[PDB]
Assembly symmetry: C3
Homo-oligomer: 62 residues x 3
């Protein structure tokens, strides 16, 4: 049993080196896309307020 | 003690695999949520621009 | 054999779990982040709809 039970544990642990390399790669990339939206949400929240202050004057002068 | 240490590893090894399968599906899922966000800003990247000049036009006309 | 072969398995898996546990933390931080950057994309959607109708008026006047 043992020699077989460690041989399939070390075979399984061999596979995990690249499983974890993948999982990390994946998350790195999702830490990126979600970093972008957090920046592009401030680009759509400030430029949307700034033109709100503009129409506020255009309709005021009418 | 070797049999126990071996048992402890098969254990700790199977919890680890599941943990990664959960993490992987959860990433698959987040990447989706970040791609829907990119599919939301595209409509604004447009909407913002369209009203960025339409107000500039109603600003020159005055 | 089993002598070192088991301590080396003890070390490779100890390592791999801290890895998964740090990656784990990062997935949750990102998922929570990308829920908010998305939650707030609906209100941003409301806010830019409110202004899309004012112009429809300003362009009607002029």
């Amino acid at each position: 049993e043992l020699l077989q039970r460690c041989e399939s544990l070390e075979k399984k642990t061999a596979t995990f080196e690249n499983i974890v390399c993948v999982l990390n790669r994946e998350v790195e990339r999702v830490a990126m896309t979600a970093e972008a939206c957090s920046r592009q949400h401030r680009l759509d929240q400030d430029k949307i307020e700034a033109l709100s202050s503009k129409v506020q004057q255009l309709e005021r002068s009418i």
